[PDB]
Amino acid sequence: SLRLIATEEAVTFQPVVDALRAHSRTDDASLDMILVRDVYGDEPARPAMIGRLSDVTGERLAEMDSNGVDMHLLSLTAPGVQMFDAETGTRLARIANDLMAQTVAANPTRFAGLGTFAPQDPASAAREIERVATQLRLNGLVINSHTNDLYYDDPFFHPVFEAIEASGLALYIHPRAPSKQIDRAFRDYGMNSAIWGYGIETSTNAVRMILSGLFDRFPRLKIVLGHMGEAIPFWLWRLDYMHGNATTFGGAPKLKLKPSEYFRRNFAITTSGVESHAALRYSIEVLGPENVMWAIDYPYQPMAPAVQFIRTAPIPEDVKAMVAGGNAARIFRIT
Amino acid sequence: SLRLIATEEAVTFQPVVDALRAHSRTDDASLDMILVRDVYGDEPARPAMIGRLSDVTGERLAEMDSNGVDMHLLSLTAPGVQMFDAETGTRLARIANDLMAQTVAANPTRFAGLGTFAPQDPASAAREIERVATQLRLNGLVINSHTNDLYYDDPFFHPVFEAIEASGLALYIHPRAPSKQIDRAFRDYGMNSAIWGYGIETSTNAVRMILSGLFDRFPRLKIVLGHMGEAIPFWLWRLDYMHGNATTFGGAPKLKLKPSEYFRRNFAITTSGVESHAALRYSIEVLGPENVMWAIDYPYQPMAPAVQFIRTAPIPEDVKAMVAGGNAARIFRIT
Numbered sequence: 001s002l003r004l005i006a007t008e009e010a011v012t013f014q015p016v017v018d019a020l021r022a023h024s025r026t027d028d029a030s031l032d033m034i035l036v037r038d039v040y041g042d043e044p045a046r047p048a049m050i051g052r053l054s055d056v057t058g059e060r061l062a063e064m065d066s067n068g069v070d071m072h073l074l075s076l077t078a079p080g081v082q083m084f085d086a087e088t089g090t091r092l093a094r095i096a097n098d099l100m101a102q103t104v105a106a107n108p109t110r111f112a113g114l115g116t117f118a119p120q121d122p123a124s125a126a127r128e129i130e131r132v133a134t135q136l137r138l139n140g141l142v143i144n145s146h147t148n149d150l151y152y153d154d155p156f157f158h159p160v161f162e163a164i165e166a167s168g169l170a171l172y173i174h175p176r177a178p179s180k181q182i183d184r185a186f187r188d189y190g191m192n193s194a195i196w197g198y199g200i201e202t203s204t205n206a207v208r209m210i211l212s213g214l215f216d217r218f219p220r221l222k223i224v225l226g227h228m229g230e231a232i233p234f235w236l237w238r239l240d241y242m243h244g245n246a247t248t249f250g251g252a253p254k255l256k257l258k259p260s261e262y263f264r265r266n267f268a269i270t271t272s273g274v275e276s277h278a279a280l281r282y283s284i285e286v287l288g289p290e291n292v293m294w295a296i297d298y299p300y301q302p303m304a305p306a307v308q309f310i311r312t313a314p315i316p317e318d319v320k321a322m323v324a325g326g327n328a329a330r331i332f333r334i335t
Numbered sequence: 336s337l338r339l340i341a342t343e344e345a346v347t348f349q350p351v352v353d354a355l356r357a358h359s360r361t362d363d364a365s366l367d368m369i370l371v372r373d374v375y376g377d378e379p380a381r382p383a384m385i386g387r388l389s390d391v392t393g394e395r396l397a398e399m400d401s402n403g404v405d406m407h408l409l410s411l412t413a414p415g416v417q418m419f420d421a422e423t424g425t426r427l428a429r430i431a432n433d434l435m436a437q438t439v440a441a442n443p444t445r446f447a448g449l450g451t452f453a454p455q456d457p458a459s460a461a462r463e464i465e466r467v468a469t470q471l472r473l474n475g476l477v478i479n480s481h482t483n484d485l486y487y488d489d490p491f492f493h494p495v496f497e498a499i500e501a502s503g504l505a506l507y508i509h510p511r512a513p514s515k516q517i518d519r520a521f522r523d524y525g526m527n528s529a530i531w532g533y534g535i536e537t538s539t540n541a542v543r544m545i546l547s548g549l550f551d552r553f554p555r556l557k558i559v560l561g562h563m564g565e566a567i568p569f570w571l572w573r574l575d576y577m578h579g580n581a582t583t584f585g586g587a588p589k590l591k592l593k594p595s596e597y598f599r600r601n602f603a604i605t606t607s608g609v610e611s612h613a614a615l616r617y618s619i620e621v622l623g624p625e626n627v628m629w630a631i632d633y634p635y636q637p638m639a640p641a642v643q644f645i646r647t648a649p650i651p652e653d654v655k656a657m658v659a660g661g662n663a664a665r666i667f668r669i670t
């Protein structure tokens with residue numbers, strides 16, 4: 001019946017797990033070290049997670065079958081390879097992308113894959129992006145918000161976005177913990193994570209990208225944001241209203257379009273972790289039905305409630321088909 | 336015949352203006368110094384603003400009359416008295432509150448008022464809050480997000496919230512620029528201000544308040560957030576979903592209610608700066624029509640579009656009356 005393609009479905013591979021185990025013992029002050037110790041560290045607070053992330057053919061497929069989920073679009077879980085030094089990140093990105101391709105090929109009717117990269121080295125990341133698109137023929141790209149506590153308005157990353165735009169692959173900008181620029185306010189009450197910091201970190205990255213004019217430089221970029229667009233869809237009117245003040249008094253560059261127009265033209269969103277019919281309806285209304293995709297955020301969230309959320313959405317069947325899988329099949333080139 | 340009570344309407348008074356002019360010359364590193372120099376500085380980029388903020392019975396009333404706006408609920412404009420040292424802030428809050436009460440008393444069918452205080456000195460602020468409630472008989476309170484780069488989960492401010500709860504006055508937590516904990520990411524593209532920083536700063540403050548259990552300690556507090564609730568209404572499902580992880584792994588304290596239940600019980604929102612029928616409809620649906628109030632954000636925004644936004648809202652007339660003014664009359668003690 002309804003074709004369900006879940007678009008934010010995390011996976012990991014042993015070489016990355018091993019590298020993160022080692023990294024967990026270092027003095028890295030990144031706020032992601034909370035997650036990294038909890039999942040990849042010695043005496044981990046979340047001991048089952050590595051196994052669940054690594055598994056593709058056991059529990060994961062069983063749960064897909066029990067819930068009638070056609071596909072997972074897999075992505076190397078945050079923080080990807082971004083916490084490592086440039087050489088290590090670059091090496092592990094290739095390894096992880098090869099393993100992603102192999103994972104997809106073992107069950108291509110049930111899995112599609114996003115490749116990743118190490119923007120610590122923008123030139124090498126650009127080469128890897130090209131390899132992912134043309135040599136591995138993967139479905140798209142994923143990166144986890146900031147790299148080296150810089151956001152994607154920084155011209156340092158222009159070679160990355162040039163390659164992404166040229167490749168035609170959509171880039172899913174997944175969260176990671178608040179960067180060092182903002183992490184002081186996220187050290188309490190678990191706010192480092194999905195409950196708050198993930199959304200603030202990722203949305204602020206994207207807003208900087210828009211306001212910096214990144215999408216005039218690279219107008220064919222396609223960006224995807226989970227968690228109902230990291231709430232950016234809610235802020236569209238205010239982003240537009242206040243833009244004049246930003247360019248007049250704040251040194252913001254003049255843009256060809258309004259901020260919300262970049263959001264509708266260059267972005268699409270997914271419903272990961274936001275199983276709200278009201279928020280889904282709002283997003284369809286302001287973005288258009290072509291710009292909203294379904295996701296689970298497995299294994300960090302369970303499949304059944306995410307599935308039931310979309311199966312029961314109070315929207316027409318044709319729009320429901322678009323959200324459940326049609327838009328994803330287009331954006332991520334899935335047949 | 337629709338009674339329009341605008342709830343986020345900024346004003347200033349000469350003693351505060353004079354103090355901010357002097358403050359503008361100092362080496363303060365607060366991100367609010369951008370606003371303060373633009374408006375109160377010796378060489379202001381926004382030279383008309385002091386006059387427009389100071390004006391109550393001239394341009395402001397003429398514009399209210401031409402647009403059929405019954406009332407402004409006035410508040411001392413951000414950053415209030417919060418940038419000053421404790422003794423200066425305390426004295427100026429007292430003076431500004433006397434001037435607010437006198438302004439209101441001059442035209443009490445057209446103006447209501449929120450008193451303010453200097454949380455730099457919680458014990459003195461507590462006395463002033465009581466005076467605002469019982470002697471000046473003002474309509475509520477206003478404070479501008481952080482004080483001293485601390486948020487309102489900090490036990491330092493417990494005496495303030497104890498007094499606010501006991502007074503029965505609602506506290507409008509208006510924005511100011513991102514605190515030093517987060518300001519590094521808001522130095523570009525005018526993001527210090529309303530376009531992005533204001534919402535991130537204010538929403539993060541409120542989320543810390545909720546997650547810290549402040550509303551179990553003071554369950555009768557009423558908090559009001561502008562800008563369509565600083566987007567917290569959009570995040571309710573995820574805040575609730577992830578709360579288990581926060582209390583299990585993140586050291587968040589155990590709470591009597593769910594995060595969204597505090598938001599609906601203890602908060603109400605206004606539409607200042609978010610003239611979106613879609614966002615208004617979403618907020619009414621998830622918060623209830625009793626929890627949404629209309630505002631303009633004058634003089635930072637013009638009255639006519641804000642008025643026309645609510646007059647044309649695609650909601651029933653009774654709900655429209657609640658949003659336009661009925662809820663404000665209840666929450667802010669207006670006859």
Ligand SMILES: COc1cc(C(=O)[O-])ccc1O
Binds near residue numbers: 194
């Ligand atoms: C590391 O990536 C994630 C982590 C969590 C979490 O920690 O609950 C949730 C969703 C995510 O995709």
Ligand SMILES: COc1cc(C(=O)[O-])ccc1O
Binds near residue numbers: 237260
């Ligand atoms: C009419 O202009 C806009 C409308 C909205 C909306 O209501 O969703 C958002 C941004 C805008 O610039």
Ligand SMILES: COc1cc(C(=O)[O-])ccc1O
Binds near residue numbers: 245412414529632
């Ligand atoms: C200082 O308070 C505000 C400033 C602005 C601004 O700078 O455009 C807008 C709304 C506010 O209430």
Ligand SMILES: COc1cc(C(=O)[O-])ccc1O
Binds near residue numbers: 423426427429
């Ligand atoms: C002369 O010192 C102060 C005066 C006042 C006042 O006048 O309300 C308030 C606080 C002070 O520290």
Ligand SMILES: COc1cc(C(=O)[O-])ccc1O
Binds near residue numbers: 275276278572573
């Ligand atoms: C059913 O539980 C919830 C629903 C919503 C919603 O859909 O607005 C938000 C928070 C919740 O916990």
Ligand SMILES: [Mn+2]
Binds near residue numbers: 297300
């Ligand atoms: Mn995820």
Ligand SMILES: [Mn+2]
Binds near residue numbers: 472473474668
């Ligand atoms: Mn009164």
Ligand SMILES: [Mn+2]
Binds near residue numbers: 343345607632635
């Ligand atoms: Mn305001």
